[PDB]
């Protein structure tokens with residue numbers, strides 16, 4: 001219902017009273033998250049510039065502050081000591097120049113000679129509203145102040161369409177590389193385009209990374225290369241991916257692909273996995289960004305929200321949030337994702353659990369529930385439930401002969417993008433034990449399965465009084481329930 | 489230099505781009521606090537509505553978001569689990585009605601039947617810009633949403649001037665009371681006016697609290713009654729207080745007065761102390777608010793900033809911050825002030841200290857330094873220092889025969905309200921040991937002396953590279969230095 005004209009009106013054409021009212025409405029929503037990054041107002045999308053710089057972790061965010069829609073985008077900035085306690089540093093990059101006149105689109109951050117380079121796509125729209133994507137390298141100093149150049153680092157080559165964006169800038173084997181999401185103009189196929197530079201001034205196009213003969217959709221958004229336990233891992237968003245390659249149920253998937261080896265000079269990838277896999281088996285994860293931190297870990301964080309989708313909170317004039325930070329690991333040829341050790345510092349009021357059918361009559365809105373469930377069982381765990389278990393988030397489990405987890409949000413509250421289904425299923429090994437580490441925060445749930453072998457992340461909109469946690473049947477398990485303190 | 493017209497322009501007449509730019513400028517200031525409450529933009533003053541409600545601590549703030557000046561005021565809202573980790577809930581009360589058309593001035597919060605009543609002064613200005621102060625009772629619900637009535641609870645009586653504000657609403661001995669700061673129309677003397685109600689609907693004026701025959705200045709701002717270890721304690725701001733009653737060096741003082749007994753029905757106070765005393769011996773504390781929490785403690789928090797004063801950060805378009813929360817105690821007939829136990833959770837990188845002249849060559853911008861210094865010594869402790877100790881915050885101590893502490897900020901950076909002096913002195917007991925617990929955060933320093941017997945709080949603006957901590961001479965002492973994590 002918001003027209004193009006309304007979405008692209010400049011921030012200076014909105015009044016400040018409207019913005020202050022929107023900040024109040026977002027912060028005081030009964031569906032707001034209070035230990036995950038969320039918008040101060042309006043809509044949040046893709047994580048950007050995820051980095052370590054000047055003694056702390058940095059994270060930037062795609063932002064449209066005036067409503068629950070993809071209006072003209074800016075970067076906002078947060079920092080933290082520990083990947084958990086974030087503090088807001090305000091807007092960072094505005095759509096205020098010719099290069100970015102219709103948005104400061106997504107990008108990355110790389111430390112260089114005591115500064116943090118912020119490489120992003122300028123979403124230019126010309127006199128005729130034709131999109132011309134520019135790749136821009138801005139610079140942030142040790143006081144978090146940003147300067148932007150007058151000229152693009154990379155102009156769009158003739159062989160890509162208008163879709164050519166989301167640069168990842170990094171240093172590898174003494175050279176600089178940029179990975180970009182690209183649509184080939186002739187085939188309309190999705191690719192990761194590689195550029196290289198010795199000096200950050202002149203860029204050479206090495207060409208599309210060779211990901212085999214099968215198409216990766218019609219566009220790749222938010223490509224990332226991170227090294228995890230010495231393996232090159234791609235994390236990327238192939239819009240229109242053929243489900244023959246990999247099943248997924250969300251409108252657009254967020255995949256990962258582990259390589260044995262990558263050669264960015266020759267645009268070669270040697271796959272470890274025969275096929276890419278879903279990063280997240282849940283309902284709402286997109287635009288994951290990852291980076292290699294100086295502690296020797298690779299960290300990722302996800303937009304919880306999908307393009308071209310709607311949510312029940314739209315009428316409250318704000319949208320979406322982030323996942324918690326995930327530390328990455330490769331084990332047994334698969335990507336594992338772990339909560340960072342600092343998130344334990346939010347825990348309070350520990351309860352020990354042993355075989356209790358009702359875990360809590362009323363658990364509050366922010367908790368962590370960690371369970372060890374025996375093999376050979378079937379049943380349902382209800383979270384954010386009413387008393388009679390008819391309205392809840394359901395985790396339907398079987399650890400017996402047809403083992404699997406089905407997460408069902410149909411009865412949890414109002415419908416959420418129901419054209420893409422109200423259930424998500426994760427196969428499990430027959431007759432094996434099951435670990436769950438479940439984080440609830442307002443209208444966000446993150447389920448870490450079998451110590452991070454799988455992660456299911458989703459929005460859900462339960463009535464405020466629906467806080468019960470219970471199994472439907474007597475279940476053999478041990479675990480702990482903690483409240484999680486508000487920090488945001 | 490900001491005219492009346494500019495200060496009173498409605499928030500809707502500012503553009504949102506200006507507000508977003510101001511949020512960035514405030515948050516990224518190299519003088520910003522990162523573990524104390526600070527404005528998201530513009531100017532912060534008096535703490536308001538300090539309370540416990542709906543499972544958490546609440547604090548509201550006088551705010552003018554558009555610059556470093558006392559423009560037309562609103563309340564903003566923060567909450568926390570622990571009086572340390574605050575999260576922003578946005579604007580709460582706007583100057584958007586006839587009752588508060590020229591400001592939502594200060595006030596208090598009292599829980600009532602599952603709601604939080606917010607009692608505040610409406611700063612009305614009529615057709616002729618004549619001030620008419622109204623006392624208004626607004627109501628907040630369990631989702632932090634506020635409704636405001638159409639009519640005032642208390643209209644200004646004929647015997648007070650236009651200065652009649654800052655209501656403290658509370659329940660005591662089964663009745664409701666309101667304490668207001670008042671200027672008598674005939675004498676132009678400062679008073680605390682007492683109102684009482686059985687139902688919160690009809691208010692009866694009990695009259696000025698009898699604080700003896702000596703005048704308490706020309707106006708009392710921000711009056712508070714809190715019960716501390718069963719003593720009634722007044723905390724208040726008597727503008728124009730005669731220094732014959734008590735020495736103070738700040739433009740306007742923030743005093744406290746312990747009573748043996750108070751009778752709010754008869755407007756009687758029985759003093760324990762012969763005279764009121766300074767709450768804070770430093771350079772910048774004003775408008776302290778306190779309340780009795782359900783854990784049985786009394787807690788206070790202070791505006792760090794003074795009316796009618798200027799600061800070096802004014803050119804960065806933001807102003808001021810809060811103190812940390814202080815837990816109150818009465819000991820030996822004096823008010824002691826203690827950090828809350830939760831602030832220890834910010835500590836990291838502990839260093840043990842024993843007699844070292846140089847504590848740190850470079851301590852960072854956020855730390856806690858706790859020292860035990862032997863009796864019989866004299867010297868200077870330099871904080872936020874250059875290498876040669878010529879530019880620093882100085883704590884000049886003597887624990888020998890003329891014992892005292894002098895805090896000197898003259899060489900720390902640019903001048904700060906120098907008409908009110910660059911030193912503050914606290915007498916100490918001759919030939920006694922000295923405890924200091926010093927918190928540095930950006931441009932804020934809080935010095936807790938002798939386990940909270942005195943507190944000195946000040947702004948200071950050191951060069952970013954001035955981070956040395958050192959004694960000028962060999963000094964006998966033990967202590968600890970911790971870094972303090974950013975949370976805001």
Ligand SMILES: OC[C@H]1O[C@](O)(CO)[C@@H](O)[C@@H]1O
Pocket residue numbers: 045046062073105106107121165166221222286287307
């Ligand atoms: O907000 C704009 C950004 O969002 C995406 O469409 C993915 O969600 C990116 O390709 C683009 O940079």
Ligand SMILES: OC[C@H]1O[C@](O)(CO)[C@@H](O)[C@@H]1O
Pocket residue numbers: 533534550561593594595609653654709710774775795
């Ligand atoms: O911001 C307005 C408030 O500030 C004071 O002048 C004290 O600093 C109060 O008496 C008034 O309510």
